[PDB]
């Protein structure tokens, strides 16, 4: 059967819940469990999305989480999934209070979740805490060396997911790139059996929000069908909203197919943001840093001629 909210969110864990984010159908809370930070996503089911509409996110979250402990195709560059629960009950008042605090400070585009009755079902996905998004870190990164590390981590992570699962993220905006301190000097990945390293520059990247993502295992495709969605393809003001139109154009509005080019489009959007909307604490006023800047500029202007993240990682001069 379903379980009460208290099964997932015992008193002390619930007391420490703060809202950190949201989606069109979701609320994300940060908390502590057994002295360990976690990120909780809570999605209402039936009644808003159906179970069938939520399952893809569950499967994808699961498959990408598994890549951290595989061998031939291995990456930590997406986020650990600790557990999945189907919960029944009205929204916990302590969660409402945390919800309100976020509405008062940042503003929510969601409905205050106070209208749910005690037979309401929810899917509660509990993840490792991945850190703070790249947008919030717009002014806080240290140098363009860091920016290069970040792009290399993203590119590799997508490459491995391409090789393993024929993955497309399909919404990798700078809000979905998390950063977290690591004392590791070098990060490791393995692509089709070949291991390599990336200088961390003190950070570990984690990719999130598989809400539009696509993959497959054994000829079964798991995805979000947005072919009858109109609103997604009629935004602007940011280069983000062009990617949605480019994907739709590249794939002829058939979202089951595999088009890893879409990973390249999103990495280009992120390289653009690195070059145009970030301010680094150290400026590129040394020969070595100017050089790094030039190579990122050269990546920006050439990467769109690569067919996938795999192609970029193996072949692009930025990573050699």
Ligand X SMILES: Cc1cn(C)nc1Nc1ccc2scc(-c3ccncc3)c2n1
Cα–Cα distance for residue pair 240/150, rounded to 1 Å: 19
Q: Which is nearer to ligand X, 39 or 161 (CB)?
A: 39
Helix 240-250 / helix 261-276 crossing angle, nearest 10 deg: 160
Cα–Cα distance for residue pair 248/239, rounded to 1 Å: 15
Q: Is 171 in the site for ligand X (CB under 6 A)?
A: no
Strand pairing of 177-181 and 203-207?
A: antiparallel
Identified catalytic residue from 34, 118, 171, 272: 171
Residues 172-191, interacting with ligand X (CB under 6 A): 178
Q: How many residues bind ligand X (CB under 6 A)?
A: 15
Residue 176 known to bind ligand: yes
Residue 295 known to bind ligand: no
Other Cβ atoms less than 10 A from the Cβ of 205: the count is 26
Among 8, 14, 17, 28, binds ligand X (CB under 6 A): 28
> Could you tell me which of 260, 261, 252 has the C-alpha nearest to residue 227?
252
For tokens 């996905």, name the residue.
125
Nearest approach in angstroms of CB 291 to ligand X is 33
Among 127, 189, 258, 280, binds ligand X (CB under 6 A): 127
At 35, is the secondary structure helix, strand, or coil? coil
For tokens 């919800």, name the residue.
99
Among 21, 56, 92, 260, binds ligand X (CB under 6 A): 21
Q: Is 20 in the site for ligand X (CB under 6 A)?
A: yes
Cα–Cα distance for residue pair 303/309, rounded to 1 Å: 9
Q: Which is nearer to ligand X, 178 or 312 (CB)?
A: 178
The yes-or-no answer on residue 242 being catalytic is: no
Q: Is 165 in the site for ligand X (CB under 6 A)?
A: no
The pair of three-digit structure tokens given for residue 275, joined into one six-digit string: 């070059």
Other Cβ atoms less than 10 A from the Cβ of 245: the count is 14
Q: Is 61 in the site for ligand X (CB under 6 A)?
A: yes
Cα-only R_g, the chain: 20
Q: Is 39 in the site for ligand X (CB under 6 A)?
A: yes
What is the H or E stretch that residue 82 is in? Answer: strand 81-88
Q: Which is nearer to ligand X, 36 or 197 (CB)?
A: 36
Q: Is 23 in the site for ligand X (CB under 6 A)?
A: yes
Residues 190-209, interacting with ligand X (CB under 6 A): 208-209
Other Cβ atoms less than 10 A from the Cβ of 48: the count is 15
Give residue number: closest CB to ligand X: 21
Q: Is 99 in the site for ligand X (CB under 6 A)?
A: no
Nearest approach in angstroms of CB 181 to ligand X is 14
Q: How many CA atoms lie within 13 A of 44 on its CB side?
A: 21
**Segment contacting ligand X (CB under 6 A): 21-29, 153-161, 215-223, 273-281?**
21-29
Interacting residue ranges for ligand X, rule: CB under 6 A: 20-21, 23, 28, 39, 41, 61, 79, 127, 129-130, 178, 208-210
User: Which residues are catalytically annotated?
Assistant: 171
């Amino acid at each position: 059967g379903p379980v009460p909210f208290s099964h997932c969110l015992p008193t002390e864990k619930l007391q420490r819940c703060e809202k950190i984010g949201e989606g069109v159908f979701g609320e994300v809370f940060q908390t502590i469990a057994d002295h360990t930070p976690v990120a909780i996503k809570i999605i209402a089911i039936e009644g808003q999305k159906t179970f069938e509409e939520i399952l893809p996110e569950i499967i994808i979250s699961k498959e990408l989480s598994l890549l951290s402990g595989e061998v031939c195709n291995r990456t930590e560059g997406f986020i650990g999934l600790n557990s999945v629960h189907c919960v029944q009950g009205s929204y916990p008042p302590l969660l409402l209070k945390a919800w309100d605090h976020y509405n008062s400070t940042k503003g929510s585009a969601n409905d205050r979740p106070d209208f749910f009755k005690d037979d309401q079902l929810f899917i509660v996905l509990e993840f490792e805490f991945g850190g703070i998004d790249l947008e919030q870190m717009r002014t806080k990164l240290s140098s363009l060396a860091t920016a290069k590390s970040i792009l290399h981590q993203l590119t590799a992570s997508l490459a491995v997911a391409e090789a393993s699962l024929r993955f497309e993220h399909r919404d990798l905006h700078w809000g979905n790139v998390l950063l977290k301190k690591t004392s590791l000097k070098k990060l490791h990945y393995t692509l089709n059996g070949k291991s390599s390293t990336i200088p961390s520059c003190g950070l570990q990247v984690s990719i999130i929000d598989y809400t539009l993502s696509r993959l497959e295992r054994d000829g079964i495709v798991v995805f979000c069908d947005v072919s009858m969605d109109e609103d997604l393809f009629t935004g602007d003001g940011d280069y983000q909203f062009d990617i949605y139109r480019l994907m739709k154009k590249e794939n002829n509005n058939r979202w089951g197919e595999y088009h890893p080019y879409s990973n390249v489009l999103w990495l280009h959007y992120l390289t653009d943001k690195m070059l145009k909307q970030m301010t680094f604490k150290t400026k590129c006023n040394t020969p070595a840093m100017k050089q790094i800047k030039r190579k990122i500029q050269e990546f920006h202007r050439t990467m769109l001629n690569f067919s996938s993240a795999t192609d970029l990682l193996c072949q692009h001069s930025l990573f050699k």
